[PDB]
Every structure is written in C-alpha cells, then in structure tokens.
Symmetry: D2
Subunit: 286 residues, 4 copies
Amino acid sequence: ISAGAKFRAAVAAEQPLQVVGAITAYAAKMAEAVGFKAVYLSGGGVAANSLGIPDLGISTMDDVLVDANRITNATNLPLLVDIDTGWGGAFNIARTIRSFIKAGVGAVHLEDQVGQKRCGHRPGKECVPAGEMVDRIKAAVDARTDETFVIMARTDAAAAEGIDAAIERAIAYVEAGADMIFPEAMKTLDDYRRFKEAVKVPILANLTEFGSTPLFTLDELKGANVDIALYCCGAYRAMNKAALNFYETVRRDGTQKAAVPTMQTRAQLYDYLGYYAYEEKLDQLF
Amino acid sequence: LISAGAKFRAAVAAEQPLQVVGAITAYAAKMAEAVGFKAVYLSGGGVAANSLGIPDLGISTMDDVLVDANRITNATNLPLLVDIDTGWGGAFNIARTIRSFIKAGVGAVHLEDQVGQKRCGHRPGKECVPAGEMVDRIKAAVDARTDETFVIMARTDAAAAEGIDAAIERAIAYVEAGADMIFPEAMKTLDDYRRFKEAVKVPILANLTEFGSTPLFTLDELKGANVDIALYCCGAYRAMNKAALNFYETVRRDGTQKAAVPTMQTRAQLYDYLGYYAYEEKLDQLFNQG
Amino acid sequence: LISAGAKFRAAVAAEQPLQVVGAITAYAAKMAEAVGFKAVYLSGGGVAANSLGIPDLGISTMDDVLVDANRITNATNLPLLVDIDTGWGGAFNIARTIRSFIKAGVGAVHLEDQVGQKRCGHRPGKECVPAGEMVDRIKAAVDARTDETFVIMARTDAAAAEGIDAAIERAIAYVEAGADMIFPEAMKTLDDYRRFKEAVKVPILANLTEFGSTPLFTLDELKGANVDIALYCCGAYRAMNKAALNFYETVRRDGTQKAAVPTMQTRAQLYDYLGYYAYEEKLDQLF
Amino acid sequence: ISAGAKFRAAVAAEQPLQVVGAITAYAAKMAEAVGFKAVYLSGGGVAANSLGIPDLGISTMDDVLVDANRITNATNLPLLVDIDTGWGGAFNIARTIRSFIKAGVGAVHLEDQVGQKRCGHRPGKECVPAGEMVDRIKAAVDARTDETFVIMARTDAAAAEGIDAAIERAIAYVEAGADMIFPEAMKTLDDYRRFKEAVKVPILANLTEFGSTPLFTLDELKGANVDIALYCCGAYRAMNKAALNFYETVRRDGTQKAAVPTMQTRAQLYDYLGYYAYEEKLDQLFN
C-alpha cells in the first residue's frame, strides 16, 4: 500500500490536513505518536540543521536523500519532501523523482525558482517563465513510475508579479500534470479562496513563523477551502532554542542541574522509540 | 593548520576539568562552539534514537555514525569525540573503523569492553568481555592509528558487576595496551573517581548523565576529585526533544502554533549562529568590481 | 508494477535451469541484460575486492553492499540477487538488512549458516552454526520480510566438514524455517545435486565458480541433475581485471597504449549500451 | 605528507608524468603495483561504469565522492579527479573543494564549460565567458585550505575559438590562481609546445582513444615540453570488452569454459590485494 496513496488518503480524510515538519527520524516518530497523519522534510531544514549551512541552494539531492531515508524507515506516515528545483535539467529531475519514489517518500514539491546561476551571483528570489516550469513538471510526471505519488508545484510568483499572474501560472502547472499547488506568501484568507476556486486542485497553506503570512487557524483555513496546513519549521526552532539554553546554562553554572526540568525523561524516550516492542518481537519468535 | 587529535589534547591541557557537550546535529555543534566550549561529543545512543529512530540495541552501524560525524566536523572546528561502541567487528574491522574516523577529521574516539555479537536470538543487555579480549581490541586500534595525536579512549562497564577494584585492574591493562585515556562508567561517589585517577595515572572522564544512577556532580566537585573531562552527553537532545513534542501537541490541540512561538529561536538568531552574513561578505569580496 | 521478487520467481519458472551472472558495476549489469540474461548477481567478495580493495574477510559492511546494490537496480530492470553473508549481526540487524534490501529494489537475497563474529583476533577460517542458530536467522528474516514475493535463500557450507547428509538435514530445517530456495556450497558430483533437490524439494542453486573445487558443469549436465539455477558469480570481474592489468602493463612498458587499443570496447558501442540515444528521444518526446 | 604534495613531487620526478585512470579501487591498486606514480578518476568514467548512464552532467558531486573515497582508501598514490564545473555557484564550488580535500584527493580539475541550462536543452559542449571561469577558479582557490592541493583548469575553447583565444584564457586562469592547465583537443605536437611556452605552468596532455587527438608517445610529448600524460579511459574500455565477451561466451556455450584463459587467477588476485599481509598482522599483534 503505497506512500503516495497514504498521502492522498490523508488529504481526503482530514480537511484541512495538518502536516508537520520533522528534522530527525525521532521527531517524526513523535509527530506520529501525537496523532498527525503526515510529516514534512524542509529543504532549508536539512541545510541549517543537518549540514550547518544557510539555505543558499548548497544542499544537494543526496543530502536531502539521507534524511528522507532515515525518516521513512522510522515512521509509517506519508512524508512530503521539498526538492527545490530538482537539482538540474530534465535528466536530473528524472533521477530525483525516481530516487525519492524508491526512498518511500509519498509526495514531493518542485518550485519555479531560477535554478543554477552565474558563479558569482548573489542569492535572490527570481522566477522562471511559466513554460520553463511547465518543462520541469513534464519531466517529473513522465519520470514518475507510480501515479499515486504526488507531484506538487510551488510558486513564489505572487510576490513580484501579483496574485493573478500566479493563478495563471498555476493553471498551466496543473495542465502539465501537477497534482497539487503550493502558493507562497499569501496575505489574506481571500487570496487562498480565489486561488482554490481558480485551480480546482488541492492547495497548501504554508504557516511559517516570523514571516509575512499571518499564522491562520485550522478553522480560518477550512473556511477558505484550503486542503493542507503546513507547519514546516516550528518544531526545529523550538528544539534549537531548548538546545542553546542547555549549552548556556552548562557553561554558566558549571553543571546542567538547572536545565533538567526542560528535558525529556528516559521512559518517555523508550515509549516513543517503541523500545518495549523489541523485547516483545524477540519473545514472539523464539 | 593543526590536527583534530592535537586540538583535543590541547583542550584537556587548557581547561581542567574540560567540559565537553554532546550534539546530535551539525547546528547544535555550531551553537556549542558559539557558547564557548572547547570540544563536542557524538553519542552512539544519540545517533540511534535521533538520527535513526531506533533504540540503542547495537543496531546502529559504523556508517550511520560516520555520516553524522562528517556533517559535524565539517560544520565546527572544535575537536569531536565519538562513541564507537565495540568497533563493529574483529581486529580488521576495528582497524577500518579507526582509519575511517581519522579521515573524517575526528580528534578522539572511545571503544568499550562490551561483548560484541551475541547469539542471533539473544536478549539486549550489558556484559563485558574478558580483560584479555579488550586488550586485543585496543592493540588493533593503536596499530591502525596513523597519527599519534589521535586519542584512543577505553571505556569500561566492569565496575557495576565486578566491583571497582576489578575495573581499576582492567584499566591499567588497557593503558598498557596503548589507551590514552579512560572512561569509567557508573561511579557513585567522588572518591571512586579519586582512586581511579590515582591508579591509572592517565586522563579520566566523568559521564554526567541525567536520569541515571550517577549524581550530577559540579565542575568544582570533579576538579577536587582530579577528573580531567566532564561529559554532558545527552542533555542537549533531551531538551530539544521535549520542546519538539510540545510544539507538536500544541499544534494538534489548538489548530495553530501561536501558543508555542515564544519557545522558538528567532530567524535573526538562526542567522547569527549560521554564520549567515559571512557568506554575503565573501561573494562581495570575491566578485564585486568597484 | 511487478516487484523485483516476482520478476525473479517468474524467471526461475521460465528458464530451467536459469543462468544468473555476476556484475561488479552498474554498466556490467546493463551489458548482461543486453546479452539476454534474465537475472543478475551481486557477489559479496566481489564488492569487497573490487569496490573496496580488500580481501573477503567479513570487513565489507551492509552499507558497502547497499550502495552497489542501489547503483545496479537503478541501471537495469532485471531482478538482482545479493550475497548478504550472515546478515551483519543479530535478529534486529538481520531485520534491518532485509528491509533495506527490499527497499533497494533487490529481487532475492541469500544468507549463509557460517558463524558471525568471534574472538577479536580469530583467524579467517570457515565454521558452521548449529542447525538451530541458522533457523533463528532465517526466522528473523522471514518475519521482517514485508512482501512474500521477495526471495529468501539459505546457503550452507556444511557439506565440506560434516558430509552431504548432515547438509541435507540442515537444509530441510531451513525450508522449515521459511527459506524459499537453497544454495548448497561445494558439491563434487552431479549426483550430489540430484539427491539434494530430491530431499529438499525446493529450487536449488549451483555455484559454478572458476579456480575452485567444483567442476564447471554445463547447462545440460545441470538440467539432467534437476538444478534450478546456474550461478556464474565472478567470471565477469576476473575477466575484466586481467584486461585492466594488461592495459596498465603495456602503458608502463611501451610509453603508449597503442598496443592495447584492440582489446578495448569502442567509445561508440559504450554509448549504445548506456542507451544514450534514448535520452535524445525523451527530450524530443517531451519538449 | 599531503596528497597534494605527493602529486607535485610526482610531476617533478617524472617528465612527462604518466597518470592512468581507474574505475575501481582494485584497478588503482594494480596501477600502483605496475609502478605508476599517480592515478585518475574520470568524470564520464564514474557516470558510465558506476551509474550506468551517459556523461550528460547527471553525475552528482556525491557520486564522484563515493568513488573518490574508495580509491584513496585503497592506494597511497595521489589521485586526480574530474570535477566538471564544480556542481553549482561559488558556494558549491567551495563545498566541492573542501569535500575533495578531506577525501584525500590530491588534485582536482575544473573546466570552463557551461552549466546548467533551460530544463530542456540538448547535449553539446559550449564554453563560458573567460570572465566566468576566472570567477570559478577564484572561488576554488579561496576555499582551498592547504596550498599543496593542486587546482587544475581545463579548457575546451581551442575547438571553437582557435588556439590563440585558448592560450589567452589560460593566462587569465593562471592569474586567477590555477596551478596547472589542461588544454583539450590539441591536433599537433606544436600546439602543445606553444601553449606550455605561453602559460609557463605545468601542462597536461589527454591521451584519449577513439577521439581526434593522435595517440602521442612519451618521447613525442617529452620533446614538446608536456608535463603530464593522461591515459584516462583505456583501462575501463579494455575491462568492459573482456566482460561482455564473458557474458556472450556464457550465453552461447552454456558454460564459461572457453573464457577462463581470459581471467586473472585467484592466486593473482590475492597478491595484488595485500592478502597474506592481513594474516601477518594478526601474527604481529597476537603472537
């Protein structure tokens, strides 16, 4: 029963569907325990946390691969993955799609940002002409070996070209075979409503903190006809503050005593780890 | 440019006892460096639970630890200490292990006297091998070592089942076999450490682990006991896991993360520690023509 | 939508005995398919000596084999059989192994009943576990298997030290434990194979390896013996390794490779088997 | 002693220096046994052999990484690696240089070609503004943490812009910090002679079979003042034919009998692989 199918089922069963970002395998396991139906691997998340570098397109397909693998082996929730521009031309996009299907990843999102650029370039927010993204999607859809796997198109056109330009690109992207649409940086509930009505496929709302977008509630979004609510980064920002706090209190106090009330207990780890199931499996066989 | 091993030896000479903190990600290590620590640690059970999502039952392979170890040494220039369990096999494998982690740019490593591969259906759980068998393990590691500044540290769990004196005996044999430093597990009093340092005469590590049997000794207490290294191996990631769980729960409960944002690290903060503007300042210095 | 496992079982049914050839690299496997074989093999010692440059002394890790296995199943559509030695550890590790190789798109996997790790300074020799320890190994594997089409094959080296009948008895116990097929190491006669197939009643593999004890039996000989799989595990790489040494030698001797160019596959043939022109079509068929 | 230093030493000690490509760790070991002072990792070599796909810039930095690691672990000769255009902008080139330093490689070669392009664009080599390749090199030189590591600039300009334009670019590339230059597709011995005299740094000659370039002798190149003779692909073309031949004889004859005189023996594999040396250490350590 395929990962793609698990993801499509989850969108049909919960409206809007909450999907939370995880930076580690264990994070995902927790997200599962808490009752979510889908998890997300952020591209900038891979780069900052796993690699220790800014989100400047330094991140390679394999970097994202090793994380995506660790995660789908650890949870049985469908995982959605940020694959930037696909890391190259039509043949590379193809390799990408195939690699991430094989990794057991359930849905995937491609974006209409300029790709590789001019050695000395500084790093900005340009789009590609609609026919250039249409090419990308076409390559992706043809490379796809199992139709249940979800190919989602992400667009940041709205910011520079206005929301109508964005809607018109989006329709061309569904034309080219994209299953769902991720419109970046919408300012109002109405923006979403209009978008959903125009493109007529499932839509994702990126609920990002410290951005421009307000942090809309599940109900707000349900009323707006949005299909997917995405909390991409909260988890790791929360965990990174907790970790800095630990380090500071150890360096200041000469002991970590003051920070132990902010820790998870061993029994809670074993519980989430499904640790008791092993001693169990060992019995059942022997 | 100085070797990772030399950096670690220098750090022990320079700070007594030396605080060394565990990090489960590259970024965590970066933060530890920013806060002023001189050395960082990669915990074996840390790799297994966090990176892989599985208990510490020796399922973790050398390669699992390798990818994490590489990501970390690439991201900080503080010397890193790595838990390498039993070395993942016989003398030939211990050799490959040693070579691999040297090349990875690590500065120190620690092998334990735990029993290697049990029977297939065996239960999980602690047990040491004969002393004479760990001596073999160390011998293979010392031999494979290509650069003497690289630190090989021997870890023993013998104290718990054979008493402290037996453990001290083993440790002397382990220094004989070439071990540079000793990591004695599960000491209950400051005296235990004092005696141990006295007997083995090489640098000694204290594992300050929370929710264990070991009390959480202070830097002073340990300095007075003549301990060389204070190791906070797991705190960081336990803290971070709680914060994560809390995020997830408040999102599922409230239909928004609003309530949780005060518990997050800002973006401006992320960029400070991410060295972010130093990148912009390179593209300019390299390609601006004015 | 046919899984690597089902492709392999189908290929056993369709060709008897089935010829299955070893490949050390992705390209090798592409050739093997072009030549018309229905299945390919990734040899454990093959990984170790060629990819890693080290002897077959159990140094090779599960990930070493994984990366090669991945490259190969990405590059051909034939089902692949992989040597996974002892499974790289206890029941939990055997499980991780089975799951990892399933995901890698491998069709079939053989495990052997050798001992795992022993004393640190133990010399490289050959030893068997109790028939019971290997039953546990198989049980772990079968349980971890998520798709029954995936073939779990048990290999035994018992014959050598305990005689043919002990080995037969083990094998029946391994089928008991869930093993789909059996790989009996080092048989001397066509009769050995015949009796073995008769007793174990599941598909049987014959390891046709060069420079060993085993004679190089022909397809017909094996057909008449009731053998299901003929395995040529290493020929390919020994052939290519000599070719390579020869090239290095002639270059160091002559100060040019001119003498060696007749042994080389042409830039042009390479390009064809990699199916380079099929990419042009795609670009055209897309844009 | 760094692998950068080993490589620079080797160029000073043997002129011109012969350097041969290896597609596997074992191949490299053989190359060393035969007496070569350096080996080469071909970009197209990684793509075709390890991956099973054409040299159309599909190959990633990691693909080349895993092969590069396997090789430098298995031989102690300095290795030279084809790194194409560096796999992205200035920050990617930087990551690339750092990665290949830490992998123990000794010299890298960057080339002034185009990358990447419009999703749909067909294969066909085109160069960039010289201004752009200078930026690439600057990025590399800056990211380099150990001077002894050799950064080599490769250009394909001669083919479309004439030999003079190429010499001009080359001088600008040495300006930008490039240590040595690799001028693609020279037709005559004189082309090389003029180039070395113009750029005044060490020069590489790509001795490629089935190409345009004649297969020049060590002497011919010595007389032309060339520093490095590069046999990048011979080895694996030779080994690929031997392998196809194996597969064909097996499918034809129903046995490999006819092929075994092509094969490198078991006894020979063990030599080349250090083998006994493992046993000798167990004695060293535990007797």
